[PDB]
Structures are given as C-alpha cells and as structure tokens.
Enzyme design. Structure first.
Site, PDB file in Angstrom:
ATOM      1  N   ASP A  82       0.926  -1.345  -0.163  1.00  0.00           N
ATOM      2  CA  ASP A  82       0.066   0.197  -0.146  1.00  0.00           C
ATOM      3  C   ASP A  82       0.683   0.966  -0.039  1.00  0.00           C
ATOM      4  O   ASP A  82       1.814   1.440   0.978  1.00  0.00           O
ATOM      5  CB  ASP A  82      -1.090   0.012   1.445  1.00  0.00           C
ATOM      6  CG  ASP A  82      -2.212   1.104   1.256  1.00  0.00           C
ATOM      7  OD1 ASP A  82      -3.169   0.625   1.539  1.00  0.00           O
ATOM      8  OD2 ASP A  82      -2.164   1.687   0.311  1.00  0.00           O
ATOM      9  N   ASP A  93      -3.672   7.289  -2.509  1.00  0.00           N
ATOM     10  CA  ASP A  93      -3.490   6.207  -1.833  1.00  0.00           C
ATOM     11  C   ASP A  93      -4.024   5.073  -2.627  1.00  0.00           C
ATOM     12  O   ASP A  93      -5.149   5.066  -3.096  1.00  0.00           O
ATOM     13  CB  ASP A  93      -4.656   6.183  -0.670  1.00  0.00           C
ATOM     14  CG  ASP A  93      -4.883   4.860   0.427  1.00  0.00           C
ATOM     15  OD1 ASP A  93      -3.827   4.248   0.117  1.00  0.00           O
ATOM     16  OD2 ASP A  93      -5.473   4.749   0.891  1.00  0.00           O
ATOM     17  N   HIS A 153     -11.940   4.790   2.376  1.00  0.00           N
ATOM     18  CA  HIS A 153     -12.035   5.933   3.092  1.00  0.00           C
ATOM     19  C   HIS A 153     -12.156   7.435   2.399  1.00  0.00           C
ATOM     20  O   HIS A 153     -11.878   7.429   1.422  1.00  0.00           O
ATOM     21  CB  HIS A 153     -10.888   6.093   4.026  1.00  0.00           C
ATOM     22  CG  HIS A 153      -9.546   5.887   3.352  1.00  0.00           C
ATOM     23  ND1 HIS A 153      -8.410   6.657   3.145  1.00  0.00           N
ATOM     24  CD2 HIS A 153      -9.121   4.604   3.018  1.00  0.00           C
ATOM     25  CE1 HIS A 153      -7.318   5.935   2.626  1.00  0.00           C
ATOM     26  NE2 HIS A 153      -7.864   4.612   2.738  1.00  0.00           N
ATOM     27  N   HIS A 161      -8.265  10.170   6.625  1.00  0.00           N
ATOM     28  CA  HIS A 161      -9.408   9.439   6.592  1.00  0.00           C
ATOM     29  C   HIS A 161     -10.413  10.344   7.071  1.00  0.00           C
ATOM     30  O   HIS A 161     -10.509  10.972   8.212  1.00  0.00           O
ATOM     31  CB  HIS A 161      -9.160   8.528   7.364  1.00  0.00           C
ATOM     32  CG  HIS A 161     -10.555   7.322   7.559  1.00  0.00           C
ATOM     33  ND1 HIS A 161     -10.416   6.142   7.457  1.00  0.00           N
ATOM     34  CD2 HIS A 161     -11.840   8.101   7.693  1.00  0.00           C
ATOM     35  CE1 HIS A 161     -11.848   5.670   7.414  1.00  0.00           C
ATOM     36  NE2 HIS A 161     -12.659   6.898   7.698  1.00  0.00           N
ATOM     37  N   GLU A 187     -11.287   0.342  -1.269  1.00  0.00           N
ATOM     38  CA  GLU A 187     -10.367  -0.799  -1.024  1.00  0.00           C
ATOM     39  C   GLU A 187     -10.959  -2.165  -0.602  1.00  0.00           C
ATOM     40  O   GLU A 187     -11.122  -2.417   0.572  1.00  0.00           O
ATOM     41  CB  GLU A 187      -9.095  -0.387  -0.186  1.00  0.00           C
ATOM     42  CG  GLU A 187      -9.393   0.206   1.220  1.00  0.00           C
ATOM     43  CD  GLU A 187      -8.076   0.725   1.780  1.00  0.00           C
ATOM     44  OE1 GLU A 187      -7.155  -0.133   2.183  1.00  0.00           O
ATOM     45  OE2 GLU A 187      -8.089   1.897   2.134  1.00  0.00           O
ATOM     46  N   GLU A 280      -6.626  -1.220  -4.334  1.00  0.00           N
ATOM     47  CA  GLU A 280      -6.957   0.098  -4.063  1.00  0.00           C
ATOM     48  C   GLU A 280      -6.574   1.180  -4.987  1.00  0.00           C
ATOM     49  O   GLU A 280      -5.421   1.045  -5.546  1.00  0.00           O
ATOM     50  CB  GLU A 280      -6.819   0.339  -2.520  1.00  0.00           C
ATOM     51  CG  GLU A 280      -6.509   1.666  -2.300  1.00  0.00           C
ATOM     52  CD  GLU A 280      -5.885   2.130  -0.679  1.00  0.00           C
ATOM     53  OE1 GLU A 280      -4.939   1.494  -0.317  1.00  0.00           O
ATOM     54  OE2 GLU A 280      -6.529   2.888  -0.106  1.00  0.00           O
TER      55      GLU A 280
HETATM   56 CO    CO Z   1      -4.020   2.268   1.029  1.00  0.00          CO
HETATM   57 CO    CO Z   2      -6.518   3.419   1.888  1.00  0.00          CO
END
Ligand code: CO
Ligand code: CO
Length: 295
Positions: A82, A93, A153, A161, A187, A280
């Site tokens: 990630d 992200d 998020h 977030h 995600e 994601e």
């Molecule tokens: Co992430």
């Molecule tokens: Co994330």
C-alpha cells in the site's frame, strides 16, 4: 479545486507502485523494499502521505518494516503493497497484492475485480452501499470472503481519513451519497478466512491526533518533532528510530499514547489466519464517471 495536485500525486503513486512491484522479489529484505519505495516517492517530487505498508500473507494492513526488521520475502508470499503520496496535502492512496515469484491467483483476482466493480458504478449521486454491494458480490461470487471490518475512506487535504466509509459489504444504512468533487479510496479485501481482521502487536504506525501537554522531556520533544515534520499524516515508528535509542523512544511514544497526542495503528491479522488479498485506487467523484487518479 486543485485536482491537478490530487492527480499529480496519484501519478507518483502509480509509478512508484509499479517499481515496488518489480523490486519485490523472493529474498528481498522487507526493510529495504520499504525504504526504496519511500525514497522514490520523494525522488519524484512526492512526499509520503504515510509509511509504505507491506503486509505479508495473513496480516492484512498496517505493517511497515522497521530498522531491525529481518523479514525477507519467501516465494509464494502474498505481499500487499500500500503506497500513498501527497503533494501540498492532496493524497493518492493506491495498493496492490503481489504473489512473490508467481502469477495472480484466483483470490487476488477476486479483490482486483471487486475494486473494478466498485469503480465502474461510482458516480455522483449514488449511495455508498451500492459500491459495497458491488464489491461484496464479486468476492463472494468467486468463493471468498470480503473482510467485513476493513473499508475504504473519504479523503480530504491533509486528512487521510475524513470520516465516511465505503465498506466491502452491503449495509442498508450506508447512505452517504457521492457528491461531485468527492475523492475516495476504494479498497476491497478478500480472504479465505473468517472474513474479519483483528488488532495485533506490535504497533509500527502512529498518527498525531491532539496537541496535549506532556510532562516528560523526551516526549515533548518527540511530540514537537512529530507535529513539525509530520502533521496530520501517519508516521512510522521506523522514522523516529535515528533520533533516540530504542528503550527511550519506546517510552517516548508510549507516553504520548497514554496522553492522547498520537493514535496507535496496530498490525491487523485475519482472525483465522486466512490469507488476505487487497487492491485499491483513489477516485475523484465526477458527475458521470469517476477518475482514477492512480491507474
Ligand atoms: Co491504502
Ligand atoms: Co486506503
């Protein structure tokens, strides 16, 4: 707004994500990969929006190596990578699972497919629950289970977030409606286990959450450093390791924790030790389609 930023961040994200994939070889020491990635973010004009996370097999999220971590990648490992980078505060992200030294298996497919499905139906004016319904159906149709207690998020500048979630399940009460300009991270997580994750030691990622006064000297420093260099965005324990010796730091951090100046993000392991896969992307909610800043 400054979509040019969110996009430019996604761009670095993508790019460094790809190399991350390529470096992830069997034998590769975990600590290194982490650093290589993190160093490239910067090298591209980016800033890490948070520590790169390399969660292996059953551990789903929140694991970032540390100075002293001797973890190495065995062939067959399901390395979820990630990455997140920000530019002036706008985040990208993005994440991906990689089966160390092998090809994408059916599980990984379930997740990747879930993400697509979420993405394809995300548009202005739609309840999140639809997304979660989309994700759920693709993971279950193929035989696995979506991690129920992990979700996507909403993102806002210098806020990883925001507070609205896009779970990997359909709940009739997730009624938030996508508004133009909203930017979300979708995600899905899939597993062969129970379909639930649980907090587990150690804790390697922390986030400054409140400017509260600390009595002990080291803490007030640590804290003052944290606030300065990091701000609202999550930081690794690893990042503070070359400031002060282990035992001390340990205390420093713990103290800030009991006070409530930073939140601890423990490691997450599947409750039945079932392999966990994940994918994601960051999406900027347009009116008819969304735009995947990171793919
Ligand atoms: Co992430
Ligand atoms: Co994330």
């Amino acid at each position: 707004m400054d979509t040019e930023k969110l996009m430019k961040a996604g761009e670095i994200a993508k790019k460094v994500r790809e190399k991350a994939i390529k470096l992830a070889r069997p034998g590769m020491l975990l600590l290194e990969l982490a650093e290589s990635i993190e160093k490239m973010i910067m090298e591209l004009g980016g800033k890490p929006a948070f520590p790169v996370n390399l969660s292996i097999n059953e551990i789903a999220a929140h694991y970032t190596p540390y100075k002293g971590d001797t973890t190495v990648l065995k062939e067959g490992d399901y390395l979820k990578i990630d990455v997140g980078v920000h530019i002036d505060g706008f985040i990208a992200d993005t994440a991906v699972t990689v089966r160390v030294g092998m090809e994408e298996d059916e599980l990984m497919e379930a997740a990747k497919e879930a993400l697509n499905a979420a993405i394809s139906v995300a548009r202005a004016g739609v309840e999140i629950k639809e997304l979660g319904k989309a994700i759920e159906n693709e993971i279950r149709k193929r035989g696995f289970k979506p991690i129920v207690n992990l979700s996507g998020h909403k993102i806002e500048r210098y806020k990883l977030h925001a507070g609205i979630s896009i779970p990997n399940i359909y709940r009739p009460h997730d009624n938030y409606v996508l508004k133009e300009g909203d930017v979300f991270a979708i995600e899905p997580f899939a597993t062969i286990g129970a379909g639930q994750v649980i907090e587990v030691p150690p804790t390697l990622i922390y986030m400054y959450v409140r400017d509260v006064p600390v009595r002990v000297a080291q803490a007030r420093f640590l804290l003052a450093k944290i606030k300065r260099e990091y701000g609202t965005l999550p930081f690794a324990y690893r990042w503070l390791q070359n400031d002060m010796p282990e035992g001390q730091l340990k205390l420093a951090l713990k103290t800030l924790e009991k006070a409530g100046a930073i939140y601890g993000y423990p490691v997450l392991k599947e409750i039945r030790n079932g392999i966990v896969a994940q994918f994601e992307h960051t999406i900027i909610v347009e009116k008819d389609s969304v735009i995947v800043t990171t793919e």
